[PDB]
């Protein structure tokens, strides 16, 4: 719990969602000021926003958001650090000229973010190209775990009883099962936004015609300018079957060999 | 749910839509057998069909077509008590010396029906001549509850977030509220078509001019034939203001003091 003098906003958001806002803010330590972003609400958002909270507490990876704390003042407020560059799938947007190479440096540390997550045994459960956030050109973080569940001790999945199904896989569709492979399905997702520049997945099509193009073996094709050997890898990321589909582990493992042959 | 061995479809259809089609067939009861009329689908359809009917279910007025039950077989099913002459604007376009008092008798019928749904806090949300269906040339029935929704306990309109924009409201067009007195004005276009014999409202025109005229403060002039005292009633369902517009007992009891002056 932060001191509510302690921090300054700035009046103009950065963003706005069906939470509340987002704002800039200022954040003061012991000598220094610190930039923050501020997750702003407006009975079930407070104890959301508390839950997400607790999860970034137990997270400790340079590619992941790190939360400062929250506060609880005129509105319900989780305080981090700020990305000052923003969500990924707008960078890439704003600046087509990006990249092949640093496409795939921020992908290969999207997926060390996620090697993280899976060994601490989260599930994210929101993997997508809005839910990385820039902190230069060359420095992406995972954000956004309003959705992450801390898997139980005896469970290698999270049971669920409005989602982004374009990004889910299919037990999660099928089973409401999320465990670390789902993330996996749904970071090759992100892989194609990325590659893409920041392009919607499955444009034009509902989540039923999503489901029925899966079902029926078909995959988003190859980006323009994308690499085979990153098209196969969210091909492997897209496999049906979860118990076939790689982990992180080996998912980061490829993009860090293939990265460092391209450099 | 029903059985579907006590369910005997007819092989030719009684129409089509976009809604699947609709057919004629009979339910094994006790000792008798009861001819229905059974809506047959051809994921969102579904979810639409068992809110109709959960809508139906519930309704219990001689002027509103009863549901016998479901019935999940070889396609999705609403079985229905069948109204053997169909619906009022195609029994009205085949029968065009149908008498005056006939037609007052019916929308009267009609407006009993709808004065039920408002006690009971239902909105129909599509009460347009193709949705009243006859029992027989003295007896119509509303049908068609793919659109209604029960009022919240707190609220006395349905918020929405194609339409049957011809037969709404302003306020339904403006603001997305629908509540009875927004049937109140469908029910003014009804009688307009019914007293016009079956013949299409605003014909010839788009929704926007339909928005365009309305606002304008014009509306659809008096059928041949038609009483003076029913287009009065007509334009007091089309007022503008929904506060000034009346309910269905004020229509139900206007209908019923004019019939009985005609009987
Ligand atoms: C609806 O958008 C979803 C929700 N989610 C919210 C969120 C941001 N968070 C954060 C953390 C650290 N840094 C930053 N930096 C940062 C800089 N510029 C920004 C934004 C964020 C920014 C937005 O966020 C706009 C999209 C709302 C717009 N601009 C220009 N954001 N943390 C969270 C939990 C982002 C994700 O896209
Ligand atoms: C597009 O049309 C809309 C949809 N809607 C469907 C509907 C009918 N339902 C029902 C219930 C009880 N009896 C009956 N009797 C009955 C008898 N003869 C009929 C029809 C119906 C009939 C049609 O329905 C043609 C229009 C398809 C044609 N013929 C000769 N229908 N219930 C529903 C929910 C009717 C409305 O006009």
Same mark, same amino acid.
């Given at each position: 719990?932060?001191?509510?003098?302690?921090?300054?906003?700035?009046?103009?958001? *950065?963003?706005?969602? !069906?939470?509340?806002? %987002?704002?800039?803010? #200022?954040?003061?330590?012991?000598?220094?000021?610190?930039?923050? &972003?501020?997750?702003?609400?407006?009975?079930?958002?407070?104890?959301?926003?508390?839950?997400?909270?607790?999860?970034?507490?137990?997270?400790?990876?340079?590619?992941?958001?790190?939360?400062?704390?929250?506060?609880?003042?005129?509105?319900?407020?989780?305080?981090?650090?700020?990305?000052?560059?923003?969500?990924?799938?707008?960078?890439?947007?704003?600046?087509?000229?990006?990249?092949?190479?640093?496409?795939?440096?921020?992908?290969?540390?999207?997926?060390?973010?996620?090697?993280?997550?899976?060994?601490?045994?989260?599930?994210?459960?929101? *993997?997508?190209?809005? !839910?990385?956030?820039? %902190?230069?050109?060359? #420095?992406?973080?995972?954000?956004?775990?309003?959705?992450?569940? &801390?898997?139980?001790?005896?469970?290698?999945?999270?049971?669920?009883?409005?989602?982004?199904?374009?990004?889910?896989?299919?037990?999660?569709?099928?089973?409401?099962?999320?465990?670390?492979?789902?993330?996996?399905?749904?970071?090759?997702?992100?892989?194609?936004?990325?590659?893409?520049?920041?392009?919607?997945?499955?444009?034009?099509?509902?989540?039923?015609?999503?489901?029925?193009?899966?079902?029926?073996?078909?995959?988003?094709?190859?980006?323009?300018?994308?690499?085979?050997?990153?098209?196969?890898?969210?091909?492997?990321?897209?496999?049906?079957?979860?118990? !076939?589909?790689?982990?992180?582990?080996?998912?980061?493992?490829?993009?860090?060999?293939?990265?460092?042959?391209?450099?």
């Amino acid at each position: 719990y932060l001191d509510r003098k302690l921090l300054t906003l700035e009046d103009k958001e *950065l963003g706005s969602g !069906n939470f509340g806002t %987002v704002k800039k803010g #200022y954040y003061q330590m012991k000598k220094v000021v610190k930039t923050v &972003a501020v997750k702003i609400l407006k009975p079930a958002l407070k104890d959301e926003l508390l839950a997400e909270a607790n999860v970034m507490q137990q997270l400790d990876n340079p590619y992941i958001v790190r939360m400062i704390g929250i506060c609880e003042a005129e509105s319900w407020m989780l305080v981090m650090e700020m990305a000052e560059l923003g969500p990924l799938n707008k960078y890439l947007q704003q600046n087509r000229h990006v990249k092949d190479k640093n496409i795939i440096e921020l992908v290969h540390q999207v997926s060390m973010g996620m090697k993280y997550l899976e060994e601490s045994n989260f599930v994210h459960r929101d *993997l997508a190209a809005r !839910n990385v956030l820039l %902190v230069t050109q060359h #420095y992406a973080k995972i954000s956004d775990f309003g959705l992450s569940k &801390a898997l139980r001790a005896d469970e290698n999945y999270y049971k669920a009883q409005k989602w982004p199904v374009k990004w889910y896989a299919p037990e999660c569709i099928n089973y409401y099962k999320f465990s670390s492979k789902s993330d996996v399905w749904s970071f090759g997702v992100l892989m194609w936004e990325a590659f893409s520049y920041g392009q919607k997945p499955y444009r034009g099509m509902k989540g039923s015609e999503v489901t029925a193009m899966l079902e029926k073996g078909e995959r988003m094709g190859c980006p323009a300018g994308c690499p085979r050997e990153m098209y196969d890898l969210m091909n492997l990321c897209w496999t049906y079957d979860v118990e !076939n589909r790689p982990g992180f582990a080996a998912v980061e493992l490829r993009l860090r060999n293939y990265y460092y042959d391209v450099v």
